[PDB]
Design a protein around this ligand. Structure first.
Ligand SMILES: Nc1nc2c(ncn2[C@@H]2O[C@H](COP(=O)(O)OP(=O)(O)OP(=O)(O)O)[C@@H](O)[C@H]2O)c(=O)[nH]1
Ligand SMILES: Nc1nc2c(ncn2[C@@H]2O[C@H](COP(=O)(O)OP(=O)(O)OP(=O)(O)O)[C@@H](O)[C@H]2O)c(=O)[nH]1
Ligand SMILES: Nc1nc2c(ncn2[C@@H]2O[C@H](COP(=O)(O)OP(=O)(O)OP(=O)(O)O)[C@@H](O)[C@H]2O)c(=O)[nH]1
Ligand SMILES: Nc1nc2c(ncn2[C@@H]2O[C@H](COP(=O)(O)OP(=O)(O)OP(=O)(O)O)[C@@H](O)[C@H]2O)c(=O)[nH]1
Ligand SMILES: Nc1ncnc2c1ncn2[C@@H]1O[C@H](COP(=O)(O)CP(=O)(O)OP(=O)(O)O)[C@@H](O)C1O
Ligand SMILES: Nc1ncnc2c1ncn2[C@@H]1O[C@H](COP(=O)(O)CP(=O)(O)OP(=O)(O)O)[C@@H](O)C1O
Ligand SMILES: Nc1ncnc2c1ncn2[C@@H]1O[C@H](COP(=O)(O)CP(=O)(O)OP(=O)(O)O)[C@@H](O)[C@@H]1O
Ligand SMILES: Nc1ncnc2c1ncn2[C@@H]1O[C@H](COP(=O)(O)CP(=O)(O)OP(=O)(O)O)[C@@H](O)[C@@H]1O
Ligand SMILES: [Fe+3]
Ligand SMILES: [Fe+3]
Ligand SMILES: [Mg+2]
Ligand SMILES: [Mg+2]
Ligand SMILES: [Mg+2]
Ligand SMILES: [Mg+2]
Lengths: 202, 200, 200, 202
């Protein structure tokens, strides 16, 4: 087992995917600011970025039966770069998607809509993987970025469900029912807030 | 020599420094609670120094002289910080942790969580003083801290947007906003109860 | 309806966005050069959008109409970024790396390093355009990039502070500032020569 | 060798010394901004913070003959938290020191002045270790912070000398003489800039 260059391979990945996050963050910040400038509403509440830790990446590769290599990771793992866009209201989610995908150097790679089709546990979010060019010192990389788009309420719910799920399944089955209740109650109140906000901005 | 009250520019400078002092304290508390218990009580923070426009209006509203000296004496929210927390009990955790510090003095406390306003507003308001070390002197300045949950914050942002138009028009939503505040309260109570159980 | 030229507020908004686009590009280049060669060519960066006050004066100075449309057409430094580099050759490294990018177009180049101004000023100035993706349209906007070493920057900050008083008074230092520029040049040449040797 | 708790000890150190850096950074930012507000000069050009990496800390402990433990590190290693304050002009260095040490919760612990007494290789900087209180969730720590105060020119010189020194002594002896020349030439030009700046701000 002499392969130390596999480790260098993953260190490169961390560096270039971190740069992809900066490119998309800047795009999103500009969209939010311009929309606010025109319509006096910020669709984005806040954003969170993370590059997948190498340990988490190797486990995912193993989980999926894939080789433990950077070439394989770059080809088959689409969430090495992840950004979470937390929006103020439900309709902001799809506004953000539309504004970003219109851009000529952003290509849609994968789309999963858990808002129209929530997961069994009650999870909601719009997930889009997009590619963006990253201009490095001596080459260009076109890299995927996984964007999770959700409301404040979806994010509150997901953070709590995550914390339960990441402490064994015994506990994740007491709260299953009550967590579903919460997801639905969050859905209902955000619908009302959205309804009010739409009327006062006609 | 007319009312060249430059003093208000001085106010903005030193109250902005007080905000940096308190923000640093809060960030350290959040980081350390996370280090020990694996939970961040703070979701995010927002700071603002009261604009001179709003400040003069408040002084007039209260029948006070239009001067920086009078503002520093009578207006406790020139420096404001908003601490948005993840769960209801984080609000009181943050308060307890800040007031334990030896260079933090409590000046005023209003808890609109235990006693919500008529329209449904909820938040814990504490005014504290902190020392600010300047180039040639020390100032002990008040800072208004609004501590609230994410849910309370969403509600307040929406209600604020209503009130800040022709304020007469669009008071039909009073009833429906109150419903939302109650519904947010109930869901956050349930989230809090779950979070308490899985963390002992 | 008098000259409610709100247009200048529009200008500030979109040229500020262009600055974010270029800054992100430069930061990524610096990070990657460091990753490969273990050197950061960038020491730090400073951004500013030209104030409306200065902008109208420039339009008047050039005999141009006082309008945002005219400003966007004729003023190439509404958005300015200053890239302060660690060594002299970093200046040209940064230029080469930026101009290689396919969505960056060169508009104008003035090299006051190869041809210093009379007072001793030195810097590389390149105006480039970049696309800015807004909510409902694309804008291709010029950005003035001043690229200089740390030594050039120290000199310029001091000279700027002189010129920006009663500008008639304090022109005795012209001679002594020129000496400093030459002395800074000579030391930075020597630092550069050492740095080149220990990095092959 | 079961001591895994030694590693936890050092992880605590990183966390609390990082907090000490935030406290001192905020103090310094406020001083610079207030001085600028009054006198229209920013004495600070920029600041750089770093918490010593655990590897570097263990090597220093070994170099000094000290036990490999967090208690020992906290007692005997004064640069776990380091901040570098780069100033615009020479006199700014001592202004910053004076303004900071006047504060009632800052105590001077150690002072080494390589400006009045430069090192043989030509290194210049004012080094002060100070203590500051850090208010944590359940306790207070009074922690040292090593502050390196220097001009822009001293910093340019030190960065280059560092890069030479950290590639074997063979090369660090060709440039010794020329590096001394540079340090002196930087000293002389900054004296002139300082002299001009003093006259135009009388
Ligand atoms: N808190 C929470 N997060 C979830 C849940 N499902 C997904 N996520 C998050 O959203 C990410 C992407 O989810 P998916 O869109 O379903 O991923 P995928 O389609 O299976 O493709 P791969 O993730 O690469 O395997 C996950 O990695 C999680 O971070 C859930 O039930 N609760
Ligand atoms: N969005 C929103 N904010 C509120 C409401 N009440 C208070 N606030 C905020 O909390 C701040 C302080 O309010 P209070 O503590 O009750 O005191 P006050 O009536 O505003 O005047 P003072 O006590 O002198 O400071 C206000 O200035 C607002 O920023 C509300 O119903 N909706
Ligand atoms: N501190 C300082 N800055 C300078 C000096 N010359 C230029 N600059 C800066 O560089 C900017 C651009 O200068 P130039 O490229 O030569 O062109 P210009 O004469 O200023 O007018 P335009 O070309 O139309 O943009 C100036 O606006 C200044 O910010 C100088 O002698 N001292
Ligand atoms: N670039 C450069 N840095 C130096 C030189 N000397 C010190 N430093 C830096 O400044 C730091 C502190 O230096 P000193 O004040 O001399 O430290 P000390 O008195 O020996 O006490 P300890 O460092 O704990 O052992 C060093 O750890 C270096 O980071 C030098 O000749 N060149
Ligand atoms: N697209 C994204 N944007 C921002 N943050 C994200 C994100 N995806 C994940 N995260 C966050 O990053 C942290 C670590 O998550 P990961 O280790 O990468 C496992 P995961 O990605 O969520 O599931 P997975 O590996 O099976 O795909 C989690 O706290 C988390 O929710
Ligand atoms: N007081 C300080 N403030 C800011 N940066 C610092 C600093 N001291 C050191 N550094 C920087 O931190 C990086 C790592 O330095 P360290 O690993 O901690 C060894 P050192 O501290 O410089 O010598 P030493 O360990 O013998 O005391 C170096 O690039 C560096 O110059
Ligand atoms: N304590 C605080 N922390 C953070 N942000 C605050 C804050 N107080 C107010 N703000 C914010 O500042 C904006 C307007 O503030 P102000 O001009 O000072 C009127 P106000 O402070 O809210 O009421 P008041 O003048 O009666 O006291 C609001 O959008 C807002 O909620
Ligand atoms: N390209 C640039 N990048 C970063 N900062 C800049 C910059 N150009 C100017 N500045 C800074 O902005 C300040 C004043 O700028 P301006 O109001 O626009 C006058 P100017 O741009 O320097 O000359 P000009 O109007 O003839 O073109 C100066 O302190 C300063 O050097
Ligand atoms: Fe403090
Ligand atoms: Fe871009
Ligand atoms: Mg994932
Ligand atoms: Mg108020
Ligand atoms: Mg200009
Ligand atoms: Mg050291």
């Amino acid at each position: 087992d002499e392969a130390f260059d596999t480790l260098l391979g993953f260190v490169e990945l961390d560096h270039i995917y971190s740069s992809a996050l900066k490119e998309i963050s800047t795009k999103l910040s500009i969209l939010d600011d311009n929309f606010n400038h025109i319509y006096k509403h910020n669709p984005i509440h806040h954003m969170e970025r993370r590059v997948k830790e190498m340990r988490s990446l190797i486990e995912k590769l193993n989980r999926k039966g894939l080789q433990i290599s950077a070439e394989t990771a770059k080809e088959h793992i689409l969430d090495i770069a992840g950004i979470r866009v937390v929006c103020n209201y439900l309709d902001d989610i799809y506004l953000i998607e539309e504004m970003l995908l219109k851009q000529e150097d952003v290509q849609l790679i994968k789309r999963k809509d858990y808002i129209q089709h929530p997961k069994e546990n009650g999870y909601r979010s719009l997930h889009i993987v997009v590619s963006i060019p990253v201009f490095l010192a001596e080459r260009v990389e076109v890299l995927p970025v996984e964007i999770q788009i959700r409301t404040i309420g979806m994010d509150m719910w997901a953070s709590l469900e995550h914390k339960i799920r990441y402490k064994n399944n015994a506990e994740t089955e007491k709260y299953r029912d009550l967590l579903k209740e919460c997801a639905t109650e969050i859905t209902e109140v955000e619908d009302k807030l959205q309804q009010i906000h739409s009327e006062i901005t006609e």
